[PDB]
Amino acid sequence: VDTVTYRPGAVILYPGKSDMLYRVSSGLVRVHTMDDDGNGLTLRYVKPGEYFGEEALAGVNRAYFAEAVTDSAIDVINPALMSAEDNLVVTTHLVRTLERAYESIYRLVGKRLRARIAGELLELKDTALATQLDSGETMIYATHDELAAAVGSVRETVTKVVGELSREGVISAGYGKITLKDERALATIAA
Amino acid sequence: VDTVTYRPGAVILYPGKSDMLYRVSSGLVRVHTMDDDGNGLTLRYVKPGEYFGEEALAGVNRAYFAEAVTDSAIDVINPALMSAEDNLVVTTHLVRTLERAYESIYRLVGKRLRARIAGELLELKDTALATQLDSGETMIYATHDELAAAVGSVRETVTKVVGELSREGVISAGYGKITLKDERALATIAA
Ligand SMILES: [K+]
Ligand SMILES: [K+]
Ligand SMILES: [K+]
Ligand SMILES: [K+]
Ligand SMILES: [K+]
Ligand SMILES: [K+]
């Protein structure tokens, strides 16, 4: 139906009653909440082609926020107007999204923070937060606070681990930027 | 289509290629995996009326196990044979299941173990693991190892917390059984 643009950091959906279905056409969206200390917790990143606000399909309310991470173009969809073919597409996306939620759970319980940090950097490599340097390396735009929210940690501990991974030579750390110097080694650490 | 019965502890689905869609008609199923130490991790309990094995809809493989917790009757469904009306039902269930996955994440990151244990007992109150004593209290059949897998902890720490909640007078602990003596107080602890 209609496409709306949002600037970085703008809220798309607040917790409350459901309404329409949304799809990322371009950019990057973050579904998140707050913990009991006010610290953020990212539930998932939503890449182009992926849907959010699906609670509209079930009429259930939404308990999360959705915000634009980068400049983003979002398509707004009416669930009733959708055709059966489109419904199959959304269903396929939901299955994949639930599979990613279960992987997030497994990793929260079963992986050390360095493994979670390494996996998250590789995930962000295929998003709008990533750019290719002249060296050919991938650089990710993320602060240590944004990483902490994505892996369920706190800034201070993420900073320590970024320091360790820099000393191991697998990343080069910057100011709100992290260059992936050895993506094979990152995959090994992440597993 | 067809309905199959499984005894307690029997494996319904192994990790591998997807096939059919499954629904619990009676009983209780557990979707789970193993961590890096061999310890179990429950992803969710599946109650009567709820679906599992949805990866069949998307043709993706399954990375989890599904097992019968109690004596259970499971309906096997062919995704292609399904009608559009049935597809809407499964889609609604998926949305709710994803909402429960996100709540699981939030609680793993943001809640202390006593809060997670208390919330889980109240969740199991409406399952086949629950029975009503003559006193009117609800009793749950669960070992401390089964609780640890449901809240992402280890047995030894769950045992300590069960001891604390017993001394606070909110449960009465038994051998593979826990009686909910004060469900209001449990809800307060869980929040
Ligand atoms: K750790
Ligand atoms: K930073
Ligand atoms: K390592
Ligand atoms: K704790
Ligand atoms: K026990
Ligand atoms: K408390």
Numbering used by the authors:
A (entry chain A), B (entry chain A): 12 to 202
Show the paper's wording.
The cAMP receptor proteins (CRPs) play a critical role in bacterial environmental adaptation by regulating global gene expression levels via cAMP binding. Here, we report the structure of DdrI, a CRP family protein from Deinococcus radiodurans. Combined with biochemical, kinetic, and molecular dynamics simulations analyses, our results indicate that DdrI adopts a DNA-binding conformation in the absence of cAMP and can form stable complexes with the target DNA sequence of classical CRPs. Among these candidates, DdrI was identified as playing a major role in global regulation for the adaptation of D. radiodurans to various stresses. ddrI was highly induced by gamma radiation treatments, and the inactivation of this gene sensitized cells to various stress environments including heat shock, radiation, DNA-damaging agents, and oxidation.
DdrI crystals were grown and diffracted X-rays to 2.0 Å. While the asymmetric unit contains one DdrI monomer, two neighboring molecules form a dimer, consistent with its dimerization in solution. The final model, which comprises 7 α-helices and 12 β-strands, contains two domains: a nucleotide-binding N-terminal domain (NDB, residues 13–94) and a DNA-binding C-terminal domain (DBD, residues 122–202). These two domains are interconnected by a long linker α-helix (C-helix; residues 95–121). The NDB of DdrI shares a canonical jelly roll topology with two layers of antiparallel β-strands, and DBD contains a winged HTH motif (E- and F-helices) critical for DNA binding. Importantly, the linker C-helix in the DdrI structure is fully folded, in contrast to the partial folding of this region in ecCRP in the absence of cAMP. Thus, the fully folded C-helix of apo DdrI led us to suspect that our DdrI without cAMP binding represents the active CRP form. Notably, compared with ecCRP apo structure lacking the cAMP, the β4-β5 loop and D-helix show noticeable movement, with the F-helix being in a position compatible with target DNA binding. In contrast to the cavity occupied by the cAMP molecule in ecCRP, this binding pocket of DdrI is partially filled with Tyr113n-Arg55-Glu65 (equivalent to ecCRP Ser128n, Ser62, and Glu72). Instead of interacting with the adenine base as its ecCRP equivalent does, Arg55 of DdrI forms hydrogen bonds with both Tyr113n and Glu65, leading to insufficient space for cAMP accommodation.
